[PDB]
Design an enzyme around this catalytic site. Structure first.
Site, short mmCIF file in Angstrom:
data_model
loop_
_atom_site.label_atom_id
_atom_site.label_comp_id
_atom_site.label_asym_id
_atom_site.label_seq_id
_atom_site.Cartn_x
_atom_site.Cartn_y
_atom_site.Cartn_z
N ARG B 258 0.86 -1.20 0.00
CA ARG B 258 0.00 0.00 0.00
C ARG B 258 0.87 1.22 0.00
NH1 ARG B 258 -5.15 -0.27 2.05
NH2 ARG B 258 -5.41 1.73 0.95
N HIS B 311 -0.86 1.19 -10.75
CA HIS B 311 -1.29 0.07 -9.98
C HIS B 311 -1.95 -0.97 -10.88
CE1 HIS B 311 -4.22 -1.75 -6.86
NE2 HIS B 311 -3.09 -2.44 -6.90
#
Lengths: 353, 356
Positions: B258, B311
């Site tokens: 993250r 991502h």
């Protein structure tokens, strides 16, 4: 004795990094050791032309040290003129640039050695890296970021996992086998190899490899193909349009072996047509690659599928330490008159294969 | 029943690749399957703002399907308005966009499921890839080629092998352990891990891993650090200027976990200064990354050391097939009334946590 050492000039880059041994500035880290042992070291990058510094020193050079990353061609004429030559060393692995056939034919007692094994992990890592980069479509992904873009579907539409792919190596020698070893925990569907000899049975079983007896059958079932074979009559121009037509449609091809194993324009055409999804590697023909070389600008239909680098995999800083140390060991075996060389390092022993 | 499916729009890209299941155009491959069963599927990317298509359909949605790659925020407010909601699915793995606390603490009978395991190999590969790209200095090398240059010493001076390096993971759950498994044949000097609980001795031994008790001592000895931990109070802002000052000098850092586990500017500063030789990964904070997020332009002293991507590591076409199949399997379990879910897929079962 007089030792002539031929390497590239790293310029500014040498001062940036002391462990960059394989350049004229840093002299394989053996400059002081050689002087202490009472020898004369000539170091140069100037290796082309009848008046080159190399040729000035060839006539009374006892030892010549070369590298495949800036290769002094040890030609028929140079061998003729080298009246005191006793030893040629490759600070690295690769002797394409040495006329071994002629040395042998002359009957002169010239030993030729290389640091066998010093390149192999570095190249095998480069293959794993290139496979992952091609298969996972990294290049256009990183390009988005530095171009301040963000569009995940443009990347994901041609990105896969290496898991579940059938991976074939052409050649299962030192590099190819270490490529297979590194692939095992990625859970490929299968690992395949083609070679002129079998892997010993326990080596085979260790990586779960299946031998395929001919190259067309090998490439026809492979999602990923990697070339890890020597360049000779059987492999020169092996990857041409005809063979590429037998590859699985959309395959990925990696070549860190020799450029001339491929026909350059045929690989480019196959990538543009979609016969290949991606091509990469660090070897070229001709080498260094000219600006117009078709492998620089070739892309697949999405503008990607190119993971080419200059020829550098075997000249990481960790490889260079191994080369420097291995060169020192060879020189020591020679200077002492023990000639206690590692058998794997020997190319010619006093002229003989 | 009514199913609301929130995915990103792939545009032309969806037409290019029929296996790109995780987009509004291709609908996880379940649109006709749902139609044949008499269900109503609403598919949209419009998920923000009160008049959004999502909010239009929330009040009588029986089922909402979401993805981490374009997350519909299933907030308390939305949950309260979702009067018929019975099931929330993640077509993928990652549930931070769903207010699990509120569901569980109220006791609302809402199940939340994800396709556990379907992301792990993909992200672990991306870690291995990124490690190799950074350590071997691939990005500036490829850039030479496409710029029609050739200067090997400029790449070699900052290129290493993975072999012989000390590699540490922060977190040794599913992804972290699969990263360690893939590193074993690369002959690292040593594999290390930090976690809040130990791996079992067997699992440690299988990858030759040694546990280090605190993060400062872990990173101090590591040439390569990879983050494979969840985001929570222990890991938020973990990689900051203070901790980065304890990294081995010139380390390489990878983060596919993250974005908020790092302090962005602190990572950029450390790369620019030489504390890090390189940084890469595919996760950002905020996400999607703004045009001027510092991790886009950051570089080391040689103009390299950046292996960032958008991502996408967990939305490769192989992962997407697993997500799509797994989502259909969860829906089948629900529609039939079997509720024969894979135990590992259950996050909440009618609002309750269940034994792992």
């Amino acid at each position: 004795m007089k030792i002539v050492l031929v390497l590239y000039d790293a310029g500014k880059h040498a001062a940036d990094e002391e462990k960059l041994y394989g350049c004229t500035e840093n002299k394989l880290g053996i400059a002081n050791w050689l002087k202490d042992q009472g020898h004369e070291l000539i170091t140069t990058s100037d290796k082309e032309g009848g008046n080159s510094v190399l040729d000035q020193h060839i006539p009374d050079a006892d030892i010549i040290i070369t590298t495949p990353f800036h290769p002094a061609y040890i030609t028929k004429e140079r061998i003729d003129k080298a009246k005191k030559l006793k030893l040629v060393v490759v600070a690295g692995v690769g002797s394409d640039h040495i006329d071994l056939d002629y040395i042998n034919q002359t009957g002169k007692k010239i030993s030729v050695l290389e640091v066998t094994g010093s390149n192999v992990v570095s190249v095998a890592e480069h293959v794993l890296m290139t496979m992952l980069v091609l298969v996972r479509n990294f290049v256009p992904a990183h390009e988005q970021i530095i171009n301040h873009d963000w569009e995940v579907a443009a990347i994901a539409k041609d990105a896969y996992d290496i898991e579940g792919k059938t991976i074939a190596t052409i050649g299962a020698g030192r590099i190819g086998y270490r490529v297979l070893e590194r692939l095992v925990p990625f859970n490929p569907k299968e690992l395949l190899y083609y070679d002129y000899q079998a892997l010993p049975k326990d080596a085979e079983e260790k990586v779960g490899a299946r031998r395929v007896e001919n190259i067309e059958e090998l490439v026809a079932q492979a999602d990923i193909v990697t070339i890890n074979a020597p360049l000779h009559a059987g492999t020169k121009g092996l990857i041409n349009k005809e063979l590429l037509s037998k590859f699985k449609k959309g395959a990925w091809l990696v070549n860190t072996a020799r450029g001339a194993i491929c026909v350059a324009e045929d690989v480019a055409a196959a990538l543009e047509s979609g016969q290949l999804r991606g091509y990469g590697g660090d070897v070229w023909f001709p080498q260094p690659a000219p600006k117009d070389h078709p492998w620089r600008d070739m892309r697949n239909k999405y503008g990607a599928g190119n993971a080419m680098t200059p020829h550098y995999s075997g000249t990481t800083l960790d490889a260079q330490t191994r080369y420097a140390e291995g060169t020192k060991n060879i020189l020591e075996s020679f200077f002492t008159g023990k000639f206690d060389y590692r058998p794997q390092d020997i190319i010619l022993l006093n002229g003989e294969y």
